[PDB]
């Protein structure tokens, strides 16, 4: 509620990596892939459509955390 609204580059990297590792483990792709064999291209296609049900849990230096949605996060 007080951290930045945008998605840092490290968060984009980790979210793409995790979504790709999920797709590669036979997870349903909600993005209507169009003949591409790379799970990372599919993960980028999903991130551009705002279809990723993951919750970035930003940790503050004292243990307190804030749970943001990958949908409710301004991707640059």
């Amino acid at each position: 509620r007080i951290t930045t609204p945008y998605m840092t580059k490290y968060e984009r990297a980790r979210v793409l990596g995790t979504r790709a590792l999920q797709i590669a483990m036979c997870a349903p792709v909600m993005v209507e892939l169009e003949g591409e064999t790379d799970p990372l291209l599919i993960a980028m296609k999903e991130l551009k459509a705002r279809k990723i049900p993951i919750i970035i849990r930003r940790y503050l230096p004292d243990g307190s955390y804030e749970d943001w949605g990958v949908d409710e996060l301004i991707i640059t």
Binding site: L60, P61, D62, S64
Partner: protein, 199 residues
Amino acid sequence: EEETYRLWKIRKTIMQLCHDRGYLVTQDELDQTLEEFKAQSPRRTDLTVLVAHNDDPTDQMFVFFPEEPKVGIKTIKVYCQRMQEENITRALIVVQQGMTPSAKQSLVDMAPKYILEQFLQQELLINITEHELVPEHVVMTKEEVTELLARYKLRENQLPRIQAGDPVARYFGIKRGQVVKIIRPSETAGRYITYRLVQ
């Protein structure tokens, strides 16, 4: 007549030090020149000043200028008596050569009843606080430190430290456990603000 120049510089520096601590000092004392200092006042017992505090009018401070180039326990007692009888709590002892080493732990031994503090005479010839590199220090109040720790989710340890013998912690008379705000004039960001716990 260089003794008078030294006395005047030390008195001006002590007036500035007392104003920076928040004591009632007039503009003339802070803008007093040598020709009028020597006009008013020769001795080293009528240079003693007694200043009042903006709030807590009972809270006043008393500046000493001992005659003995090396103050000792007896010299300290002789005007700790003065303070105890006039009903003041704070003091400031400007010494010309130093304090014999037992005296430093005596000044410390006197509990918050009568808290004293020493300053060498060569330390007051100039106001270090007016150096280009020295930032502005501001003793935070007990209600601003709490809001700071709450905003940054900090503890009082885990904050940068400023030594209790720091030449700018001794000047601003900051006790231990107090947080000081520091306004660094930065060439990069203008007026950077930092915090340091006095310890």
